[PDB]
């Protein structure tokens, strides 16, 4: 069907199984002193994390104070200059002998592809943390400073009123 | 190879986010009538803590199951209103998820 069937073990665990789970896990721990499914109550025991700390799904694999970059910068600049130079040479190829133009085209793309690699090491979450950091920091400083400004102006008004009433005495 | 129970339970949890899946599951009588399914739903609650929460793909179902948790004391009735209510309350629920995680 369109919707896959519920998992099979879901139907094994009734309320009686839930209430008898404590004694079952106590007995299992006492006896113990891929997990084989010898009893229907085994699944409620929390599954163990794989030792390799890896998870595979759909053909793809998955697994501290914030809780020479100049070399990369100059590499990027020289790569951009070489990319412009190669673009000029490739368009010249198109001009004179376009029949073999593709011979350079993908080459240029490789440099562009390398640029993407040069982005990968530069990857930005810390920079986003920084920018959010300063925006809420400056917002709270603005709120604070307007608080002492308003309380100070109220105090100044109170002192002026006190002087006015003392003069009228 | 045969996938482990981790993979199937995680995929079930992430598929629970679909409104069509929830509507289909609640359409059948014996799914809600059987206490086994709700027992499994309450068993699934323990994935809201790390490091299990680091392995999720769509955080919305995190509330949905919790919303489904509410369904055990709110009633089936309300199945018809489920798509409308999720569409209407998507903004504030996404905001509260962001507050729970992004802050």
């Amino acid at each position: 069907s369109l919707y896959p069937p519920p998992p099979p073990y879901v139907k094994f665990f009734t309320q009686s199984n839930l209430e008898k789970l404590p004694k079952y896990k106590e007995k299992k721990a006492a006896s113990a002193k891929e997990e084989e499914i010898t009893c229907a109550l085994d699944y409620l025991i929390p599954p163990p994390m794989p030792k390799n700390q890896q998870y595979r799904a759909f053909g793809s694999i998955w697994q501290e104070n914030e809780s020479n970059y100049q070399y990369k910068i100059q590499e990027l600049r020289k790569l951009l200059k070489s990319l412009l130079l190669n673009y000029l040479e490739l368009i010249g190829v198109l001009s004179i002998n376009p029949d073999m133009y593709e011979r350079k085209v993908e080459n240029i793309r490789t440099i562009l592809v390398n640029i993407h690699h040069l982005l990968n090491e530069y990857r930005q979450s810390r920079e986003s943390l920084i920018m959010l950091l300063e925006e809420q920091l400056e917002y709270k400083r603005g709120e604070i400073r307007e608080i002492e400004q308003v309380c100070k102006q109220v105090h100044d008004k109170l002192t002026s009123i006190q002087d006015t009433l003392r003069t009228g005495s | 190879p045969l996938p482990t129970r981790f993979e199937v339970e995680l995929e079930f949890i992430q598929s629970l986010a679909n409104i069509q899946y929830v509507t289909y599951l609640l359409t059948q009588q014996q799914i809600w009538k059987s206490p086994n399914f709700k027992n499994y739903l309450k068993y699934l609650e323990y994935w809201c803590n790390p490091p299990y929460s680091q392995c999720i793909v769509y955080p919305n179902c995190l509330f949905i199951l919790k919303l489904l948790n509410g369904f055990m004391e709110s009633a089936l009735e309300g199945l018809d209103e489920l798509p409308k209510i999720i569409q209407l309350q998507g903004p504030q629920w996404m905001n509260e998820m962001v507050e729970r995680w992004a802050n």
Binding site: S1, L2 | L79, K84
Partner: peptide, 25 residues
């Protein structure tokens, strides 16, 4: 003429009961 028209009694909240099954290829 027409004494009174009918009030709109639409029920979009109705979930419908369309059977879906031939999705797998």
């Amino acid at each position: 003429p027409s004494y009174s028209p009918t009030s709109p009694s639409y029920s979009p909240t109705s979930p419908s009961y369309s059977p879906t099954s031939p999705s797998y290829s």
